[PDB]
């Protein structure tokens, strides 16, 4: 990557898999090196080794390198120091939780936990930010309401809350989009929708312009045009 970044002077697009294995590898030889076990048996040189890797990957005056680094988080304990150290060092975190996979949503990206500081009302402008702010609130409310729904059900809930719940379920399944590489693992034609189009399509939903559309007609389909089309499909 350095040869590309510097010497060839081009852009790169690094991918590493899985960096827990990198941590783990260092941990194994730590013992052999005779170094006293650190927390959860990790190498005491955990920080500096991570640091050398992470620091090496950067966008210099010369090249620019876009790393995408997979991390395996044992038993989804992000608290585990090795994931936690990596969590800090990475610029644009995305968390993919098991639960979301189980909900049948592929992406498995947990929207609440995926957070990137690249999202700003300047970086992606006021509209993008505001739309996303509405999404974030809607989902967080929905999560809060899960406890109430669990025992009480839809009872103490307001009309406003009911619309929010309905929207959240629609958004939850609007996020669901098939991957091109899951024309094998799901056998559904992949769908890639341009960013501007997605912002617009999500904007419409939030405004409730398509809250007359069934919940399952948002499920595992692309854009608004597709959501509408799957509404037509269900209608038929």
């Amino acid at each position: 990557a350095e040869y590309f970044r510097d010497e060839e002077g081009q852009d790169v697009l690094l991918f590493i898999d899985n960096i827990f294995r990198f941590t783990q590898a260092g941990s194994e030889v730590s013992a052999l090196l005779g170094r006293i076990p650190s927390a959860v048996g990790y190498q005491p040189t955990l920080a500096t080794d991570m640091g050398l890797l992470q620091e090496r990957i950067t966008t210099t005056k010369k090249g620019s390198v876009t790393s995408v680094q997979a991390v395996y988080v044992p038993a989804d304990d992000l608290t585990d120091p090795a994931p936690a150290t990596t969590f800090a060092h990475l610029d644009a975190t995305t968390v993919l939780s098991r639960g979301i996979s189980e909900l049948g949503i592929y992406p498995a990206v947990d929207p609440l936990d995926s957070k990137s500081r690249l999202l700003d009302a300047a970086v992606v402008g006021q509209e993008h930010y505001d739309v996303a702010s509405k999404v974030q609130e809607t989902l967080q409310t929905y999560k809060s309401l899960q406890d109430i729904i669990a025992i009480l059900g839809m009872d103490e809930l307001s009309e406003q809350d009911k619309l929010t719940v309905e929207r959240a379920r629609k958004i939850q399944r609007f996020l669901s989009q098939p991957f091109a590489v899951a024309e094998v693992f799901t056998g559904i034609p992949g769908k890639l929708v341009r960013l501007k189009d997605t912002v617009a399509s999500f904007k419409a939903v939030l405004e409730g312009k398509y809250d007359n559309i069934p919940e399952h007609a948002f499920y595992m389909v692309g854009g608004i045009e597709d959501v509408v089309a799957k509404a037509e499909k269900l209608a038929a």
């Binding site: 038993a75 304990d77 406890d147 109430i148 025992i151 009480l152 103490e156």
Partner: protein
Amino acid sequence: ATLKEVEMRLKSIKNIEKITKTMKIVASTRLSKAEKAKISAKKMDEAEQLFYKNAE
């Protein structure tokens, strides 16, 4: 693990405590109105019962 599975279960128990607390309070709120109605109603009923009694 033990700690976390305990902890999540304890959080659940906490949330349950909170909901049952909340519910109990709201129940009290509803109860006052309920009692108010029942007096007025019972008075009306008693006037009819007056006939049934006296009629034996």
